[PDB]
Amino acid sequence: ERPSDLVVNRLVLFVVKGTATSTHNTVKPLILLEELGVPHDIYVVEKVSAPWFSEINPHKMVPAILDRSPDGRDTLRAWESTSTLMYIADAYDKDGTFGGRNVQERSEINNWLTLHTAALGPTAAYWLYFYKLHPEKLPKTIEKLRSNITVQYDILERRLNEPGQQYLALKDRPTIADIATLPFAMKSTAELFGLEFEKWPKLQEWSVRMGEREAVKRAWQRVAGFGHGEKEYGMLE
Amino acid sequence: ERPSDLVVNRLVLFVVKGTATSTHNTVKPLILLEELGVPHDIYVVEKVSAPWFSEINPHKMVPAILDRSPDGRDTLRAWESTSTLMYIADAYDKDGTFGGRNVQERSEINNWLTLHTAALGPTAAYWLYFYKLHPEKLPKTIEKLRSNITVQYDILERRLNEPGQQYLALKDRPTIADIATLPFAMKSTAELFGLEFEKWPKLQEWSVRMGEREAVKRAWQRVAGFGHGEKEYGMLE
Numbered sequence: 001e002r003p004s005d006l007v008v009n010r011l012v013l014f015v016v017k018g019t020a021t022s023t024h025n026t027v028k029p030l031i032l033l034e035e036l037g038v039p040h041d042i043y044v045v046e047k048v049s050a051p052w053f054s055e056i057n058p059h060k061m062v063p064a065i066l067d068r069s070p071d072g073r074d075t076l077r078a079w080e081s082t083s084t085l086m087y088i089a090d091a092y093d094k095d096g097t098f099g100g101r102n103v104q105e106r107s108e109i110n111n112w113l114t115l116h117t118a119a120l121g122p123t124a125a126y127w128l129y130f131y132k133l134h135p136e137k138l139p140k141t142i143e144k145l146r147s148n149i150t151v152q153y154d155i156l157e158r159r160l161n162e163p164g165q166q167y168l169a170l171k172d173r174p175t176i177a178d179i180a181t182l183p184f185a186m187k188s189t190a191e192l193f194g195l196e197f198e199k200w201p202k203l204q205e206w207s208v209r210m211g212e213r214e215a216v217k218r219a220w221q222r223v224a225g226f227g228h229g230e231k232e233y234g235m236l237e
Numbered sequence: 238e239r240p241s242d243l244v245v246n247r248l249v250l251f252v253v254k255g256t257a258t259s260t261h262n263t264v265k266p267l268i269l270l271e272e273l274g275v276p277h278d279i280y281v282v283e284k285v286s287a288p289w290f291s292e293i294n295p296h297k298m299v300p301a302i303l304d305r306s307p308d309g310r311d312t313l314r315a316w317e318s319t320s321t322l323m324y325i326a327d328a329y330d331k332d333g334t335f336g337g338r339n340v341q342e343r344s345e346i347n348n349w350l351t352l353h354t355a356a357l358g359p360t361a362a363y364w365l366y367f368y369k370l371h372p373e374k375l376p377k378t379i380e381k382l383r384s385n386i387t388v389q390y391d392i393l394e395r396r397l398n399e400p401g402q403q404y405l406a407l408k409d410r411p412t413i414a415d416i417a418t419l420p421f422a423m424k425s426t427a428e429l430f431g432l433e434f435e436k437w438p439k440l441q442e443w444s445v446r447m448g449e450r451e452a453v454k455r456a457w458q459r460v461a462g463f464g465h466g467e468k469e470y471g472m473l474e
Protein backbone atom coordinates (compact mmCIF):
# COMPACT_ATOMS: atom_id res chain seq x y z
CA GLU A 1 0.00 0.00 0.00
CA ARG A 2 1.30 3.52 -0.99
CA PRO A 3 1.18 6.37 1.59
CA SER A 4 -2.12 8.38 1.55
CA ASP A 5 -0.39 11.61 0.26
CA LEU A 6 1.25 9.73 -2.70
CA VAL A 7 -0.92 10.68 -5.75
CA VAL A 8 0.31 10.98 -9.39
CA ASN A 9 -1.46 14.01 -11.03
CA ARG A 10 1.86 14.85 -12.81
CA LEU A 11 5.52 13.63 -12.66
CA VAL A 12 6.50 12.86 -9.00
CA LEU A 13 10.28 12.89 -8.21
CA PHE A 14 11.22 10.80 -5.12
CA VAL A 15 14.12 12.28 -3.08
CA VAL A 16 15.42 11.97 0.55
CA LYS A 17 16.21 14.72 3.13
CA GLY A 18 18.80 17.08 1.52
CA THR A 19 22.38 16.54 2.83
CA ALA A 20 25.99 16.98 1.53
CA THR A 21 25.97 13.25 0.49
CA SER A 22 22.26 12.60 -0.45
CA THR A 23 21.65 14.94 -3.50
CA HIS A 24 24.35 14.03 -6.14
CA ASN A 25 21.98 11.61 -8.07
CA THR A 26 18.52 13.22 -7.31
CA VAL A 27 19.79 16.65 -8.60
CA LYS A 28 20.20 15.10 -12.13
CA PRO A 29 16.46 14.63 -12.99
CA LEU A 30 15.66 17.91 -11.13
CA ILE A 31 18.15 19.90 -13.35
CA LEU A 32 16.44 18.45 -16.49
CA LEU A 33 12.90 19.13 -15.08
CA GLU A 34 14.04 22.78 -14.42
CA GLU A 35 15.74 23.09 -17.90
CA LEU A 36 12.53 21.87 -19.67
CA GLY A 37 10.08 23.55 -17.20
CA VAL A 38 8.29 20.18 -16.65
CA PRO A 39 5.43 20.36 -14.09
CA HIS A 40 6.41 18.00 -11.18
CA ASP A 41 5.78 17.25 -7.46
CA ILE A 42 8.52 16.28 -4.92
CA TYR A 43 8.04 13.29 -2.52
CA VAL A 44 10.54 13.12 0.41
CA VAL A 45 11.06 9.39 1.22
CA GLU A 46 11.76 8.82 4.97
CA LYS A 47 12.93 5.17 4.46
CA VAL A 48 13.99 3.86 0.99
CA SER A 49 13.85 0.30 2.53
CA ALA A 50 10.02 0.75 2.90
CA PRO A 51 8.16 -2.02 0.97
CA TRP A 52 5.84 0.50 -0.87
CA PHE A 53 9.01 2.25 -2.25
CA SER A 54 10.68 -1.03 -3.47
CA GLU A 55 7.45 -1.44 -5.59
CA ILE A 56 8.53 1.79 -7.43
CA ASN A 57 12.35 1.17 -7.32
CA PRO A 58 13.42 -2.47 -6.63
CA HIS A 59 16.98 -1.05 -6.09
CA LYS A 60 15.55 0.90 -3.03
CA MET A 61 17.31 4.23 -3.89
CA VAL A 62 16.48 7.86 -4.90
CA PRO A 63 15.95 9.23 -7.41
CA ALA A 64 12.77 7.43 -8.57
CA ILE A 65 9.91 8.85 -10.73
CA LEU A 66 6.21 7.99 -10.99
CA ASP A 67 4.46 9.67 -13.99
CA ARG A 68 1.26 9.24 -16.08
CA SER A 69 2.08 7.68 -19.51
CA PRO A 70 1.46 10.18 -22.38
CA ASP A 71 -1.89 8.42 -23.27
CA GLY A 72 -2.76 8.25 -19.50
CA ARG A 73 -3.16 4.40 -19.70
CA ASP A 74 -0.23 3.49 -17.32
CA THR A 75 1.61 4.79 -14.24
CA LEU A 76 5.21 4.81 -15.62
CA ARG A 77 8.17 4.52 -13.24
CA ALA A 78 11.82 5.54 -13.75
CA TRP A 79 14.67 4.47 -11.42
CA GLU A 80 18.52 4.72 -11.69
CA SER A 81 19.52 8.43 -12.09
CA THR A 82 20.54 7.94 -15.78
CA SER A 83 17.13 6.21 -16.42
CA THR A 84 15.26 9.21 -14.83
CA LEU A 85 17.16 11.46 -17.36
CA MET A 86 16.30 9.15 -20.34
CA TYR A 87 12.61 9.08 -19.22
CA ILE A 88 12.26 12.89 -18.79
CA ALA A 89 14.07 13.42 -22.16
CA ASP A 90 11.80 10.82 -23.91
CA ALA A 91 8.46 12.07 -22.42
CA TYR A 92 9.17 15.88 -22.32
CA ASP A 93 12.23 16.83 -24.50
CA LYS A 94 10.12 17.08 -27.72
CA ASP A 95 12.91 18.96 -29.66
CA GLY A 96 15.74 16.68 -28.34
CA THR A 97 17.46 19.82 -26.88
CA PHE A 98 19.00 17.57 -24.13
CA GLY A 99 18.17 14.07 -25.56
CA GLY A 100 19.55 14.66 -29.13
CA ARG A 101 17.73 15.61 -32.42
CA ASN A 102 19.27 12.88 -34.69
CA VAL A 103 21.25 9.56 -34.66
CA GLN A 104 24.64 11.43 -34.88
CA GLU A 105 23.93 13.67 -31.79
CA ARG A 106 22.39 10.74 -29.80
CA SER A 107 25.48 8.56 -30.64
CA GLU A 108 27.84 11.01 -28.78
CA ILE A 109 25.18 11.83 -26.07
CA ASN A 110 24.78 8.07 -25.28
CA ASN A 111 28.61 7.61 -25.29
CA TRP A 112 29.26 10.35 -22.63
CA LEU A 113 26.02 9.52 -20.68
CA THR A 114 26.92 5.78 -20.55
CA LEU A 115 30.60 6.56 -19.68
CA HIS A 116 29.27 8.29 -16.49
CA THR A 117 26.59 5.57 -15.88
CA ALA A 118 29.15 2.70 -16.15
CA ALA A 119 32.50 4.29 -15.04
CA LEU A 120 32.61 7.59 -13.00
CA GLY A 121 29.14 6.99 -11.38
CA PRO A 122 29.78 3.46 -10.01
CA THR A 123 33.49 4.18 -9.13
CA ALA A 124 32.40 7.27 -7.06
CA ALA A 125 29.55 5.22 -5.43
CA TYR A 126 32.02 2.39 -4.49
CA TRP A 127 34.61 5.03 -3.38
CA LEU A 128 31.96 6.61 -1.06
CA TYR A 129 30.66 3.18 0.13
CA PHE A 130 34.14 1.91 1.24
CA TYR A 131 35.39 5.33 2.56
CA LYS A 132 32.29 5.94 4.77
CA LEU A 133 29.71 3.05 4.91
CA HIS A 134 31.65 -0.31 4.88
CA PRO A 135 32.14 -1.49 8.53
CA GLU A 136 35.88 -2.13 7.79
CA LYS A 137 38.22 0.51 6.21
CA LEU A 138 39.92 -1.01 3.09
CA PRO A 139 42.51 1.67 2.17
CA LYS A 140 44.07 -0.27 -0.79
CA THR A 141 40.56 -0.56 -2.42
CA ILE A 142 39.71 3.14 -1.59
CA GLU A 143 43.03 4.32 -3.24
CA LYS A 144 42.42 2.27 -6.47
CA LEU A 145 38.87 3.79 -6.77
CA ARG A 146 40.27 7.37 -6.20
CA SER A 147 42.93 6.54 -8.89
CA ASN A 148 40.09 5.38 -11.26
CA ILE A 149 38.27 8.73 -10.61
CA THR A 150 41.43 10.67 -11.79
CA VAL A 151 41.46 8.44 -14.97
CA GLN A 152 37.76 9.42 -15.61
CA TYR A 153 38.57 13.17 -15.03
CA ASP A 154 41.53 12.61 -17.48
CA ILE A 155 39.05 11.39 -20.20
CA LEU A 156 36.57 14.30 -19.63
CA GLU A 157 39.54 16.80 -19.73
CA ARG A 158 40.93 15.29 -23.01
CA ARG A 159 37.38 15.66 -24.54
CA LEU A 160 36.93 19.33 -23.39
CA ASN A 161 40.46 20.05 -24.85
CA GLU A 162 39.17 19.14 -28.40
CA PRO A 163 38.58 22.19 -30.71
CA GLY A 164 35.19 23.91 -30.06
CA GLN A 165 34.12 21.17 -27.52
CA GLN A 166 32.37 23.40 -24.88
CA TYR A 167 30.23 20.43 -23.58
CA LEU A 168 30.88 16.65 -23.20
CA ALA A 169 28.65 15.25 -26.04
CA LEU A 170 27.88 18.23 -28.38
CA LYS A 171 30.08 21.31 -29.11
CA ASP A 172 27.14 23.78 -29.11
CA ARG A 173 24.94 22.89 -26.07
CA PRO A 174 24.66 20.80 -22.86
CA THR A 175 22.85 17.38 -22.94
CA ILE A 176 21.71 14.73 -20.39
CA ALA A 177 25.40 13.52 -20.65
CA ASP A 178 26.56 16.89 -19.13
CA ILE A 179 23.73 16.81 -16.50
CA ALA A 180 24.60 13.18 -15.48
CA THR A 181 28.35 14.05 -15.20
CA LEU A 182 28.25 17.51 -13.46
CA PRO A 183 27.52 16.41 -9.82
CA PHE A 184 30.60 14.05 -9.84
CA ALA A 185 32.77 16.49 -11.91
CA MET A 186 32.74 19.77 -9.90
CA LYS A 187 35.09 21.31 -7.25
CA SER A 188 33.17 20.34 -4.02
CA THR A 189 32.96 16.64 -5.13
CA ALA A 190 36.66 16.60 -6.26
CA GLU A 191 37.58 18.08 -2.80
CA LEU A 192 35.49 15.21 -1.22
CA PHE A 193 37.57 12.62 -3.24
CA GLY A 194 40.76 14.41 -2.00
CA LEU A 195 41.60 15.79 -5.49
CA GLU A 196 42.62 19.32 -6.65
CA PHE A 197 39.99 20.19 -9.34
CA GLU A 198 42.32 22.95 -10.80
CA LYS A 199 44.45 20.00 -12.17
CA TRP A 200 41.61 19.57 -14.81
CA PRO A 201 41.17 23.20 -15.95
CA LYS A 202 38.87 22.69 -19.04
CA LEU A 203 36.73 20.27 -16.88
CA GLN A 204 36.60 22.95 -14.07
CA GLU A 205 35.66 25.66 -16.68
CA TRP A 206 32.90 23.31 -17.99
CA SER A 207 31.61 22.72 -14.38
CA VAL A 208 31.42 26.56 -13.89
CA ARG A 209 29.72 27.09 -17.34
CA MET A 210 27.09 24.40 -16.36
CA GLY A 211 26.82 25.80 -12.76
CA GLU A 212 26.00 29.32 -14.15
CA ARG A 213 22.82 27.96 -15.90
CA GLU A 214 19.67 29.14 -14.01
CA ALA A 215 18.04 25.62 -14.10
CA VAL A 216 21.20 24.08 -12.45
CA LYS A 217 21.34 26.84 -9.73
CA ARG A 218 17.56 26.33 -9.03
CA ALA A 219 18.08 22.50 -8.92
CA TRP A 220 21.01 22.73 -6.39
CA GLN A 221 19.10 25.18 -4.06
CA ARG A 222 15.90 23.00 -4.03
CA VAL A 223 17.55 19.52 -3.55
CA ALA A 224 19.56 20.81 -0.50
CA GLY A 225 16.25 22.20 0.95
CA PHE A 226 13.96 19.10 0.47
CA GLY A 227 12.82 17.76 3.89
CA HIS A 228 13.95 20.97 5.77
CA GLY A 229 10.84 23.13 4.94
CA GLU A 230 7.40 23.01 6.69
CA LYS A 231 7.19 19.29 5.65
CA GLU A 232 9.90 16.75 6.70
CA TYR A 233 8.63 13.68 4.71
CA GLY A 234 5.89 12.90 2.13
CA MET A 235 4.44 15.02 -0.72
CA LEU A 236 5.83 18.63 -0.66
CA GLU A 237 3.49 21.63 -1.38
CA GLU B 238 47.78 6.58 -37.56
CA ARG B 239 44.74 4.26 -38.24
CA PRO B 240 45.70 0.70 -39.34
CA SER B 241 45.73 0.25 -43.19
CA ASP B 242 42.94 -2.45 -43.04
CA LEU B 243 40.47 -0.17 -41.08
CA VAL B 244 37.73 1.24 -43.43
CA VAL B 245 34.08 2.21 -42.59
CA ASN B 246 31.91 1.12 -45.59
CA ARG B 247 29.32 -0.16 -43.00
CA LEU B 248 29.09 -0.73 -39.18
CA VAL B 249 32.51 -1.95 -37.86
CA LEU B 250 32.39 -3.66 -34.39
CA PHE B 251 35.70 -3.57 -32.41
CA VAL B 252 36.47 -6.75 -30.36
CA VAL B 253 39.54 -8.49 -28.85
CA LYS B 254 40.77 -12.11 -29.17
CA GLY B 255 37.95 -14.37 -27.85
CA THR B 256 38.35 -15.80 -24.30
CA ALA B 257 35.80 -16.84 -21.60
CA THR B 258 36.44 -13.39 -19.90
CA SER B 259 37.09 -11.02 -22.94
CA THR B 260 33.66 -11.40 -24.68
CA HIS B 261 30.91 -10.64 -22.07
CA ASN B 262 30.62 -6.95 -23.24
CA THR B 263 31.48 -7.36 -27.00
CA VAL B 264 28.77 -10.14 -27.21
CA LYS B 265 26.04 -7.52 -26.38
CA PRO B 266 26.07 -5.42 -29.60
CA LEU B 267 26.85 -8.66 -31.59
CA ILE B 268 23.60 -10.28 -30.28
CA LEU B 269 21.63 -7.16 -31.41
CA LEU B 270 23.37 -7.06 -34.86
CA GLU B 271 22.48 -10.80 -35.28
CA GLU B 272 18.85 -10.18 -34.02
CA LEU B 273 18.29 -7.33 -36.57
CA GLY B 274 20.46 -8.82 -39.39
CA VAL B 275 22.53 -5.55 -39.53
CA PRO B 276 25.40 -5.90 -42.07
CA HIS B 277 28.73 -5.40 -40.18
CA ASP B 278 32.52 -6.00 -40.20
CA ILE B 279 34.53 -7.27 -37.16
CA TYR B 280 37.87 -5.56 -36.23
CA VAL B 281 40.10 -7.55 -33.76
CA VAL B 282 42.11 -4.94 -31.75
CA GLU B 283 45.63 -6.16 -30.77
CA LYS B 284 46.17 -3.30 -28.22
CA VAL B 285 43.22 -1.21 -26.84
CA SER B 286 46.08 1.02 -25.48
CA ALA B 287 47.11 1.91 -29.12
CA PRO B 288 46.68 5.70 -29.68
CA TRP B 289 44.53 5.18 -32.88
CA PHE B 290 41.97 3.12 -30.83
CA SER B 291 41.84 5.80 -28.02
CA GLU B 292 40.62 8.27 -30.78
CA ILE B 293 37.62 5.88 -31.31
CA ASN B 294 37.04 4.99 -27.60
CA PRO B 295 38.91 7.28 -25.13
CA HIS B 296 38.10 4.68 -22.37
CA LYS B 297 40.39 2.27 -24.37
CA MET B 298 38.03 -0.78 -24.16
CA VAL B 299 35.92 -2.99 -26.47
CA PRO B 300 33.27 -3.07 -27.65
CA ALA B 301 33.42 0.12 -29.76
CA ILE B 302 31.68 0.86 -33.12
CA LEU B 303 32.56 3.03 -36.12
CA ASP B 304 29.70 3.36 -38.68
CA ARG B 305 28.51 5.74 -41.48
CA SER B 306 25.97 8.49 -40.53
CA PRO B 307 22.38 7.95 -41.84
CA ASP B 308 23.09 10.20 -44.93
CA GLY B 309 26.47 8.36 -45.45
CA ARG B 310 28.38 11.73 -45.53
CA ASP B 311 30.08 11.30 -42.08
CA THR B 312 31.51 8.68 -39.61
CA LEU B 313 30.06 8.35 -36.05
CA ARG B 314 31.11 6.14 -33.08
CA ALA B 315 29.56 4.27 -30.11
CA TRP B 316 31.56 2.97 -27.08
CA GLU B 317 30.55 1.42 -23.74
CA SER B 318 28.54 -1.79 -24.47
CA THR B 319 25.23 -0.16 -23.33
CA SER B 320 25.93 2.80 -25.74
CA THR B 321 26.62 0.31 -28.62
CA LEU B 322 23.17 -1.25 -27.86
CA MET B 323 21.42 2.19 -27.79
CA TYR B 324 23.17 3.21 -31.08
CA ILE B 325 22.29 0.00 -33.05
CA ALA B 326 18.60 0.25 -31.84
CA ASP B 327 18.49 4.01 -32.78
CA ALA B 328 20.09 3.47 -36.27
CA TYR B 329 18.76 -0.03 -37.23
CA ASP B 330 15.76 -1.03 -34.96
CA LYS B 331 13.25 1.46 -36.52
CA ASP B 332 10.23 -0.75 -35.43
CA GLY B 333 11.45 -0.51 -31.76
CA THR B 334 11.42 -4.38 -31.45
CA PHE B 335 14.46 -4.23 -29.03
CA GLY B 336 14.66 -0.41 -28.39
CA GLY B 337 10.95 -0.01 -27.42
CA ARG B 338 7.95 1.20 -29.49
CA ASN B 339 6.68 3.92 -27.06
CA VAL B 340 7.41 5.93 -23.83
CA GLN B 341 5.89 3.10 -21.64
CA GLU B 342 8.10 0.33 -23.13
CA ARG B 343 11.22 2.60 -23.17
CA SER B 344 10.62 3.65 -19.48
CA GLU B 345 10.97 -0.07 -18.39
CA ILE B 346 13.71 -0.92 -20.99
CA ASN B 347 15.78 2.09 -19.72
CA ASN B 348 15.18 1.11 -16.02
CA TRP B 349 16.42 -2.54 -16.49
CA LEU B 350 19.17 -1.53 -19.03
CA THR B 351 20.54 1.22 -16.68
CA LEU B 352 20.36 -1.11 -13.60
CA HIS B 353 22.78 -3.44 -15.51
CA THR B 354 24.93 -0.46 -16.73
CA ALA B 355 25.19 1.18 -13.23
CA ALA B 356 25.01 -1.85 -10.82
CA LEU B 357 25.61 -5.50 -12.01
CA GLY B 358 28.00 -4.50 -14.89
CA PRO B 359 30.43 -2.25 -12.91
CA THR B 360 30.24 -4.64 -9.86
CA ALA B 361 31.07 -7.68 -12.11
CA ALA B 362 33.87 -5.57 -13.78
CA TYR B 363 35.41 -4.60 -10.36
CA TRP B 364 34.98 -8.24 -9.15
CA LEU B 365 36.96 -9.54 -12.21
CA TYR B 366 39.56 -6.69 -11.88
CA PHE B 367 40.32 -7.46 -8.16
CA TYR B 368 40.03 -11.29 -8.66
CA LYS B 369 42.52 -11.60 -11.62
CA LEU B 370 44.00 -8.22 -12.80
CA HIS B 371 44.95 -6.27 -9.57
CA PRO B 372 48.60 -6.97 -8.52
CA GLU B 373 47.57 -7.95 -4.91
CA LYS B 374 44.51 -10.15 -4.00
CA LEU B 375 42.05 -8.18 -1.76
CA PRO B 376 39.72 -10.92 -0.44
CA LYS B 377 37.32 -8.68 1.64
CA THR B 378 36.80 -6.37 -1.43
CA ILE B 379 36.21 -9.46 -3.70
CA GLU B 380 33.78 -10.95 -1.07
CA LYS B 381 31.74 -7.68 -0.89
CA LEU B 382 31.55 -7.40 -4.76
CA ARG B 383 30.45 -11.12 -4.88
CA SER B 384 27.75 -10.34 -2.24
CA ASN B 385 26.65 -7.25 -4.32
CA ILE B 386 26.28 -9.63 -7.35
CA THR B 387 23.85 -11.82 -5.26
CA VAL B 388 21.80 -8.64 -4.42
CA GLN B 389 21.56 -7.79 -8.18
CA TYR B 390 20.52 -11.46 -8.91
CA ASP B 391 17.86 -11.08 -6.10
CA ILE B 392 16.43 -7.96 -7.87
CA LEU B 393 16.36 -9.73 -11.30
CA GLU B 394 14.74 -12.85 -9.66
CA ARG B 395 12.03 -10.71 -7.90
CA ARG B 396 11.20 -9.09 -11.31
CA LEU B 397 11.01 -12.42 -13.26
CA ASN B 398 8.72 -13.86 -10.47
CA GLU B 399 6.12 -11.10 -11.27
CA PRO B 400 3.07 -12.68 -13.01
CA GLY B 401 3.59 -12.90 -16.83
CA GLN B 402 7.04 -11.14 -16.62
CA GLN B 403 8.88 -13.49 -19.10
CA TYR B 404 11.61 -10.84 -19.83
CA LEU B 405 13.22 -8.11 -17.62
CA ALA B 406 11.66 -4.94 -19.17
CA LEU B 407 8.63 -6.21 -21.21
CA LYS B 408 6.39 -9.28 -20.53
CA ASP B 409 6.04 -10.23 -24.26
CA ARG B 410 9.60 -10.06 -25.80
CA PRO B 411 13.30 -9.40 -24.99
CA THR B 412 14.81 -5.88 -25.39
CA ILE B 413 18.33 -4.34 -25.13
CA ALA B 414 17.82 -4.62 -21.28
CA ASP B 415 17.77 -8.48 -21.61
CA ILE B 416 20.72 -8.53 -24.11
CA ALA B 417 22.78 -6.24 -21.73
CA THR B 418 21.97 -8.39 -18.61
CA LEU B 419 22.38 -11.96 -20.06
CA PRO B 420 26.24 -12.28 -20.18
CA PHE B 421 26.44 -11.36 -16.41
CA ALA B 422 23.30 -13.41 -15.48
CA MET B 423 23.89 -16.95 -16.93
CA LYS B 424 25.03 -20.25 -15.28
CA SER B 425 28.65 -20.07 -16.63
CA THR B 426 29.21 -16.48 -15.34
CA ALA B 427 27.43 -17.36 -12.00
CA GLU B 428 29.88 -20.34 -11.58
CA LEU B 429 32.87 -17.97 -12.32
CA PHE B 430 31.58 -15.70 -9.43
CA GLY B 431 31.50 -18.85 -7.18
CA LEU B 432 27.65 -18.75 -7.02
CA GLU B 433 25.01 -21.52 -7.51
CA PHE B 434 22.66 -20.10 -10.23
CA GLU B 435 19.89 -22.62 -9.16
CA LYS B 436 19.31 -20.28 -6.12
CA TRP B 437 17.64 -17.89 -8.68
CA PRO B 438 15.30 -20.28 -10.58
CA LYS B 439 13.27 -17.70 -12.66
CA LEU B 440 16.57 -15.87 -13.53
CA GLN B 441 18.14 -19.24 -14.59
CA GLU B 442 14.94 -20.04 -16.63
CA TRP B 443 15.12 -16.53 -18.27
CA SER B 444 18.86 -17.10 -19.07
CA VAL B 445 17.94 -20.45 -20.83
CA ARG B 446 14.98 -18.82 -22.75
CA MET B 447 17.39 -16.03 -23.96
CA GLY B 448 20.14 -18.61 -24.82
CA GLU B 449 17.70 -20.59 -27.07
CA ARG B 450 17.30 -17.56 -29.43
CA GLU B 451 19.21 -18.26 -32.73
CA ALA B 452 20.80 -14.72 -32.79
CA VAL B 453 22.15 -15.23 -29.19
CA LYS B 454 23.60 -18.67 -30.22
CA ARG B 455 25.19 -17.15 -33.41
CA ALA B 456 26.73 -14.24 -31.37
CA TRP B 457 28.24 -16.59 -28.68
CA GLN B 458 29.75 -18.99 -31.33
CA ARG B 459 31.23 -16.04 -33.36
CA VAL B 460 32.65 -13.90 -30.46
CA ALA B 461 34.65 -16.89 -29.04
CA GLY B 462 36.39 -17.32 -32.47
CA PHE B 463 37.49 -13.68 -33.19
CA GLY B 464 41.34 -13.60 -33.41
CA HIS B 465 41.70 -17.46 -33.53
CA GLY B 466 41.01 -17.72 -37.33
CA GLU B 467 43.45 -17.29 -40.28
CA LYS B 468 43.68 -13.51 -39.41
CA GLU B 469 44.70 -12.99 -35.72
CA TYR B 470 44.40 -9.13 -35.61
CA GLY B 471 42.82 -6.44 -37.87
CA MET B 472 39.72 -6.49 -40.17
CA LEU B 473 38.14 -10.01 -40.51
CA GLU B 474 36.89 -11.16 -43.99
Ligand code: NA
Nearest residue numbers: 397402403439
Ligand atom coordinates in the same frame (compact mmCIF):
# COMPACT_ATOMS: atom_id res chain seq x y z
NA1 NA C 1 9.68 -15.20 -15.47
